[PDB]
Design a binder for this molecule. Structure first.
Ligand SMILES: O=c1c(-c2ccc(O)cc2)coc2cc(O)cc(O)c12
Ligand SMILES: [Br-]
Ligand SMILES: [Br-]
Ligand SMILES: [Br-]
Ligand SMILES: [Br-]
Length: 274
């Protein structure tokens, strides 16, 4: 599939930088014809067939195809795609209140935690209903619309690892951030929608405590901890957190993907269910 090959700068003016990663940089932009504002994600293309640098066309096309499907208040939306020799440029919905990660750096109450978590669950319910596994859920990939309200609204971003799961499981080269990946990822096993549910358990643990459940001193330690389900609820952090909240986490941080709560289970769980 090919994308718009006119110069993006003929149609958009860019401004402040919103985010920066290994192969991508994201800039605020404004569309000249409408005055409407967006986030332009510039993704570096591969220069040769066998290069490890840049993102493969196959990977870019997968991400774009998934993004085009999505329309939901808790997930980022895609406006347009441009490309040139060096980059694919995604014109994405602008979410200006920063990362959940940076907001958290500023411990919540259980209500504040569940207000975020319910939105995340709603977004993931939508995604999983479309058989889309995100595979990179973490506070850095949750953006706030406006961080200056008591109950910020959020959208899930970063579909760079996202895959359609048409056969219940995928078996590809897929591996996200060690603190958040499920044991099946660590062990290079077939992956499904279940991996996201584990990541949600990790996010929930962090929301409530300010601490990461599996984090070791090196990435290898973290990965080994994940695979062994080496986490516990520290009393210093969780002493005034409800046992029902801990139950929710416990049912997500389960090694066997078949025994882990699904997104539907998570919405019916007594901690979440209205
Ligand atoms: O999507 C984003 C965003 C992003 C996208 C849309 C917004 O409205 C705001 C940030 C920011 O930094 C990144 C950084 C990355 O490495 C990868 C990404 O996908 C992103
Ligand atoms: Br700007
Ligand atoms: Br579902
Ligand atoms: Br994104
Ligand atoms: Br994206």
């Amino acid at each position: 599939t090919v994308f718009r090959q006119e110069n993006v700068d003929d149609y958009y003016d860019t401004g402040e930088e919103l985010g920066s990663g290994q192969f991508a940089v994201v800039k605020k932009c404004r569309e000249k014809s409408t005055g409407l504002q967006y986030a332009a994600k510039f993704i570096k293309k591969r220069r040769t067939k066998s290069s490890r640098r840049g993102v493969s066309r196959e990977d870019i096309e997968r991400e774009v195809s998934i993004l085009k499907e999505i329309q939901h208040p808790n997930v980022i939306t895609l406006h347009e795609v441009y490309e040139n020799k060096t980059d694919v440029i995604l014109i994405l919905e602008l979410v200006a209140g920063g990362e959940l990660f940076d907001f958290l750096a500023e411990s919540l109450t259980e209500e504040e935690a569940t207000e975020f978590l319910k939105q995340i669950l709603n977004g993931v319910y939508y995604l999983h209903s479309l058989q889309i596994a995100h595979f990179d859920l973490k506070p850095e990939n949750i953006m706030l619309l406006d961080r200056n309200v008591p109950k910020p609204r959020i959208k899930i971003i970063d579909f760079g690892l996202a895959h359609k799961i048409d056969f219940g499981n995928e078996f590809k080269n897929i591996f996200g951030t060690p603190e958040f990946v499920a044991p099946e990822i660590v062990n290079y096993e077939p992956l499904g929608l279940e991996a996201d549910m584990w990541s949600i358990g990790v996010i929930t643990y962090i929301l409530l405590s300010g601490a990461s459940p599996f984090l070791g001193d090196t990435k290898q330690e973290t990965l080994a901890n994940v695979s062994a389900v080496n986490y516990e609820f520290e009393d210093e952090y969780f002493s005034n957190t409800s046992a029902l909240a801990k139950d929710f986490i416990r049912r997500l941080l389960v090694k066997d993907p078949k025994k882990r709560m699904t997104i539907q289970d998570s919405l019916q769980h007594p901690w979440i269910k209205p």
